[PDB]
Structure formats: structure tokens, C-alpha cells
Amino acid sequence: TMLSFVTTDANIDHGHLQGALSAITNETFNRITVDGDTSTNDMVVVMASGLAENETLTPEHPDWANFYKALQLACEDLAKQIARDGEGATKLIEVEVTGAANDQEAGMVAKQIVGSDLVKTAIYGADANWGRIICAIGYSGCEVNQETIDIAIGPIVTLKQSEPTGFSEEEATAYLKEADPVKISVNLHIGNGTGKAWGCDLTYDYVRINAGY
Amino acid sequence: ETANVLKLETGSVTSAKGFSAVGIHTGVKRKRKDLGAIVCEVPASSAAVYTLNKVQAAPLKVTQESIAVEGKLQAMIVNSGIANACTGKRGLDDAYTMRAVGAETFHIPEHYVAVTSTGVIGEFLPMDVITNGIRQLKPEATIEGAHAFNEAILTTDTVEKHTCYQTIVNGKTVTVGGVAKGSGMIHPNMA
């Protein structure tokens, strides 16, 4: 189970606050996964005191984007910290998908990758296994052309237009051992859709914690 | 857009004007704090999202009912160790009781009190322990208060999880602070 409690001194009514939270949730908390088990108790509550004494915030307010960004960054930061503290994790994994049919599909593809047990274990082993990543792209349910996919792990492009690049495996492994977060980038070359998802590696300690060892 | 947004690394939920927090150890957990509250000195506009799992813990409903009255809260009370999930009518009664005892403790309307739980599924709350604990809660507008609250919501977590960002609205400093928990059974699907 995750919980998050967010407080602000912004003056804002409950309707506009709710609209912001609902939108932000879809790009932050709903884009993380540790083990794929959706809990019976997950909840986020935001409370706004109004004690900053600004003029009440709505999307028409000239400084709306300031408030919105602060709230979004706060939720993103907390979501990333949850993912990083996945049971047994040694690494946060960030997946960014570009070139999807739309932003929703980019998000679904990104999450499918970070939720794959084969991807999660490869990262634990410091294995730059683009094969496992592309397999997850393929079963995501999204619009995919299998011949036009680029995959990078950190700054190392491992697959370009669905052809392996002959990258240094020693270099890729070195990156995976030191990076936090580990960043995977995917371009599907379908449209303009972009999205991120976050997760963690799958380690022996996940099993120890959850099997009562 | 019209002003930068800056991260405050030592901030938390108590960094926003109006808010106090606390966590205490009631004994449901062996060592860590296991009951906490955040409170606001004025009625605060409130928003929430909730798991779409069709098996849902009682307090989520209770919190929704509070927020539905005026869209405002003054207290958020949380226990950890026991989820109050799959506890049926008795569990729902227990969540209403937590809300009522919280309202008494903080001298505010029941509908300004939200409640939740996290931890073991199917176990009933030890209500003498929880209710006595709620009455002892003394929120403070301090970073230590925020950290004690965050400890009080953890389950399997190895660390607390804090955030704080500040920006400017109408020339006023606006602060957004937060805490979170979660380590296992994590795949949120909330609305």
C-alpha cells in the first residue's frame, strides 16, 4: 500500500484542487509500480489552508502554472521515493517513452517495461538487456511497429531502428552499476506521444521479505 | 511559468502555513511509531484519490464521506500495522469510531476528520489501544512533528519520504509539502 498526504498554504477551492490532483495523479502515482499488486488501501489526500492569502487559484489565474508545477513536482518526488523504496530495491528505474501514438500509450508502454520481472531482474544483474525491454513493448497492447524501435540505457543507444548497435557491454554494465536512477529511453516512431514511468529492480530481498525468510 | 518553483530539501508537510503533525508509538508495532495526525488550524480545502481495487478498506469510504460534506478538512488521522481491510461491518464501525474520537480530540466537526489505515489485511483494529492513542495526539508545527507523522504511517518502508516545493502566487510565498509511504503491494490505480 502507498499513502501520500500533501499540504499547501495556497488559497484554492476544493473543486479546482481536485481537478489538479486527479490530473497529476495520472502522471505521477499511477505511473509507478514495484510488484504489480494494486492494494486495497492506496489513497492520496491534499489539504490547502489558504494562509498564503493569494487570490483563489483556478486555471484562469496568471500564476496557476506556478502552483500546478509545485503540486506536480511534489507528487512526482513522492512517487519516485516510493518506487525507490520498493521492497529489496537497490535502484530506481525511470522509463521514458517517446514517439508513441499518444501520451496515454507512451505511459502504458513505459509502465509495462518497468513492471516486467525480466527487465527488473536484468537491472539488478546490471545486464543491459534490450531484448527484455522490447518484449515488454510488444505485449503492452499499444500501437507498435516492431521494425522502428530505438532503445537507450543511460546515454548508450543499444537498439536503433530495431537493429542492435554493437555498443560496449562493459560500458553498459558499468552504467547500470553506478546509475541511480537507471534511465531507459524508448522511441517507437509512431507519433508524438511521450510519458514516463518509475519502478525498481527485483532482488533477492524482495523474495526474502515476502516469503517470510 | 511566472515565477520559479524551488525545492526545499529539509521541508515537509509542516512547512505550509497552518499545519502541524505528530506520530506516537501505541504498541501495534514493536518499536516504530504507529499512530499519527496532520491537523490544520483552519478548515482546509481538500481533495483525494483512492484505489480502484474492488476490495477496498473501510476508512477510504469514511474519508470520502467526510470530504463530501464541505470539501474541507482539519485533521487526517492514520494508523499503521493494521489495514482495517476485509473487516466488514465491524471494520467500518471502527473507522467511524476513529473519526469520532479524532473529532473529540481536536474539537472539530466529524466531517473535518479523515481517517485511514495501512498494514495487515483481515486483522481487526485494537480499538482500546487506538482510541486511547488518538486522545494523546499532540500535533506540532515542526519538522520533527512531520517526521514523527511519516514514521507513524510506514509499514515495510525502510525510509521516510518527504517533499517540499515553494513558489510565488500574487507575490505571496506558496508552499507545497508532503509525506508518503509505500514499499510493497505497489501498483497504484487511483481516482
Curated annotation (Swiss-Prot), chain B:
Substrate binds at T155, K181. It comes from the Bacteria. The record marks T118, G119 as: Involved in the stabilization of negative charge on the oxyanion by the formation of the oxyanion hole. This is Arginine biosynthesis bifunctional protein ArgJ alpha chain. The lineage of its organism: Bacteria, Bacillati, Bacillota, Bacilli, Bacillales.
